[PDB]
């Protein structure tokens, strides 16, 4: 009953105020039932608390639906009460809301994504789709995913929501500990980078930390995103007055941070665990009828994993081993569905220095589609490093981009009008970066030719505003096929001059000749000197790795291992 343009037009005009805890407010009225159940067993309390806040000055209240999802309600055997639980909630809230805003509040299922758990991107996606549909029907003024602790789950949630409506105002939230990490690893910047390019309207933090510890965390985020920001700290560092649970921070020692958050560009302020209508009554005062600030997001090219954020601000070793396309061995297994052999090759390369893993599925037509989706999701957790998805088929590309936990590096996309625009789209929808391989109908042979391809891809890239999301691959040829590698170098330089990142299929140079390791090492050094910022290579080639490291030290792009005597 209110689109996202409206809701933004408002947020741009003035900083909004949210509400505090509800569970603890139900506790005060003797109700200890699952808060989401009081929508059926005692709508009065629910209506009361919503009022306690709207009076304290809240401009937006969250529907009493945090645990309102199939997967969660199921743990408390309520899978069947889901429909009315939510509908009442929106209605109960809509009541106290009055003229204010009502946001559907959706919390995390509380299940870990496989392997840390046993849930696949699909189960999550479908889980959140169901509820987000109930709410959108009921006319919520937006939807907010609070306290999420895993980019994969939160990714499913946002995609599901957005699949339901392209007009409802969306808000994604993650919760970090004091170390600045999520449950599975995402730090503020990762989260920020990974989720900014998704069709959500705002990002934010809530719970786990008081207004104090949350301040810097909120800043890291505010720096890597231009979307609206929301924050809802706890009520100070948790303690136990009777061994139970008590939040110290008073309405004054709390409401005094509003200033600090205001300057970091916040748009919506509220409170989590320990916050009461009292606090909000002050927030209303300390805050006032202000107007939001600006900050300009610091641009940065990086891919991510649930736990690691790789920035192309140094040489990025892209592991090449997981490639059944070229290994008749690994392909035989992976086709059979072996997940172990793949998780192993993954772990090995990371140990040796690979910061990103390139994964390809060999003969795409004969590979179990559900296996791809399971591996695509799995690796990032058992390897800790991002993945360079080496798919070719458009259909596999999508089934894979969806399930990938984070911001991926998508391998391949020739400079073909169609393929490009088709790949750009998939990425704009699921997020990610693109490896544009300088070659069209057929392979270019000269530095001149490659430049025409580059020049062309640029036109297409700008045309779709996606030039800030690409790494260029000049295309390497085997020496024993008249490669003329000096032409690829002239290209690496040319692109690196224009301001782009570059990678090469290093092992392409020597296929078909002995002492492959030498030509590779040689080429890499030469390549790096010309600008090459990354290279799908074999981290297991020790000499290549060492010579590489040496090269970087020499070039002042990394530093000393400790001089002796």
Question: Is 245 marked as binding a ligand?
Answer: no
Question: Is 199 marked as binding a ligand?
Answer: no
Question: Is 272 marked as binding a ligand?
Answer: yes
Question: Is 338 marked as binding a ligand?
Answer: no
Q: Which residues are bridge partners to 309 per DSSP?
A: 304
Question: Is 360 marked as binding a ligand?
Answer: no
Q: Provide the sign of the torsion angle of the four alpha carbons 525, 528, 529, 530, taken in this order.
A: positive
Question: Is 206 marked as binding a ligand?
Answer: no
Distance CA 222, CA 231 (A): 11
Question: Is 224 marked as binding a ligand?
Answer: no
Question: Is 406 marked as binding a ligand?
Answer: no
Question: Is 390 marked as binding a ligand?
Answer: yes
Residue 433: CB partners within 8 Å, gap ≥ 6?
301, 303, 407, 408, 409, 410, 427, 469, 470, 471
Question: Is 515 marked as binding a ligand?
Answer: no
C-alpha torsion 199→113→310→175, nearest 10: 70
465: left (phi over 0), alpha (psi -120 to 50) or beta: left
Q: What share of the chain is helix, strand, coil (3-state, %, to 5)?
A: 45, 15, 40
Question: Is 313 marked as binding a ligand?
Answer: no
- The end-to-end CA distance of the chain, in Å, is 75
Cβ(268)–Cβ(18) under 8 Å?
yes
Which residue shows structure tokens 């297409």?
460
Question: Is 64 marked as binding a ligand?
Answer: no
Q: How are strands ordered across the β-sheet holding 101-106?
A: 16-17, 268-269, 228-232, 202-206, 170-174, 143-148, 101-106, 60-62
Distance CA 3, CA 451 (A): 45
The DSSP 8-state label assigned to residue 297 in this structure reads P
Binding residues for Zn(2+): 207, 234, 272-273
Binding residues for L-homocysteine: 22-23, 147
Binding residues: 22-23, 147, 207, 234, 272-273, 390, 411, 473, 508, 516
Binding residues for (6S)-5-methyl-5,6,7,8-tetrahydrofolate: 390, 411, 473, 508, 516
């Amino acid at each position: 009953m209110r689109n996202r343009r409206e809701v933004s037009k408002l947020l741009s005009e003035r900083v909004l105020l949210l509400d505090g805890a509800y569970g603890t407010e139900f506790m005060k009225y003797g109700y200890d039932d699952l808060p989401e159940e009081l929508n059926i067993k005692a709508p009065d309390v629910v209506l009361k608390v919503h009022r306690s806040y709207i009076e304290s000055g809240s401009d937006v209240i969250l529907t009493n639906t945090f645990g309102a999802t199939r997967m969660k309600l199921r743990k408390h055997g309520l899978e069947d009460k889901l429909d009315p639980i939510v509908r009442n909630a929106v209605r109960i809230a809509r009541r106290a809301a009055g003229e204010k805003l009502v946001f559907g509040d959706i919390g995390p299922t509380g299940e870990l994504p496989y392997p840390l758990g046993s849930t696949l991107f699909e189960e999550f996606y479908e889980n959140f789709r169901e509820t987000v549909e109930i709410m959108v029907e009921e006319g919520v003024d937006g939807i907010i995913f609070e306290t999420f602790s895993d980019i994969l789950e939160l990714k499913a949630a946002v995609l599901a929501a957005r699949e339901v409506s392209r007009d409802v105002f969306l808000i994604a939230h993650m919760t970090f500990d004091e170390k600045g990490r999520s449950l599975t690893g995402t730090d503020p910047a990762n989260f920020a980078i990974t989720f900014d390019e998704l069709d959500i309207d705002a990002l934010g933090i809530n719970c786990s930390l008081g207004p104090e510890e949350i301040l810097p965390i909120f800043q890291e985020l505010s720096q890597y995103t231009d979307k609206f920001l929301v924050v809802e700290p706890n009520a100070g560092k948790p303690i136990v007055e009777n061994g139970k649970t008590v939040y110290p921070l008073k309405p004054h020692d709390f409401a005094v941070h509003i200033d600090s958050y205001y300057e970091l560009g916040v748009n919506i302020f509220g409170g989590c665990c320990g916050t009461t209508p009292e606090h909000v009554k002050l927030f209303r005062k300390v805050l006032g009828n202000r107007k939001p600030l600006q900050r300009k997001k610091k641009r940065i090219f990086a891919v991510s994993s649930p736990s690691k954020l790789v920035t192309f601000d140094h040489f990025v070793v892209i592991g090449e081993r997981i490639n059944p396309a070229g290994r008749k061995k690994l392909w035989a297994e992976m086709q059979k569905g072996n997940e172990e052999i793949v998780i192993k090759e993954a772990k090995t390369q990371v140990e040796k220095g690979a910061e990103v893993l390139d994964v390809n599925f060999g003969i795409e037509s004969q590979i179990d589609v559900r296996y791809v989706e399971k591996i695509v999701q799995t690796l990032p957790y058992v390897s800790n490093v991002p993945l360079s998805l080496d798919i070719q088929n458009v259909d596999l590309t999508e089934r894979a981009l969806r399930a990938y936990p984070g911001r991926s590096l998508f391998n391949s996309a020739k400079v073909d009008e169609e393929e490009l625009e088709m790949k750009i789209n998939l990425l704009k929808k699921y997020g990610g970066t693109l490896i544009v391989l300088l070659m069209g109908k057929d392979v270019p042979k000269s530095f001149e030719e490659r430049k025409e391809y580059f020049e062309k891809a640029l036109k297409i890239l700008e045309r779709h505003d996606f030039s800030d999301r690409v790494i260029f691959d000049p295309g390497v040829l085997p020496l024993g096929a008249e490669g003329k590698p000096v032409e690829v170098l002239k290209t690496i330089e040319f692109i690196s001059s224009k301001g782009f990142n570059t990678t090469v299929g290093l092992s392409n140079l020597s296929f078909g000749l002995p002492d492959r390791s030498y030509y590779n090492t040689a080429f890499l050094v030469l390549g790096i000197s010309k600008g090459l910022s990354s290279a799908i290579m074999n981290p297991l080639d020790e000499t290549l790795m060492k010579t590489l490291n040496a090269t970087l030290v020499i070039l002042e792009k990394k530093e000393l291992p400790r001089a002796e005597v």
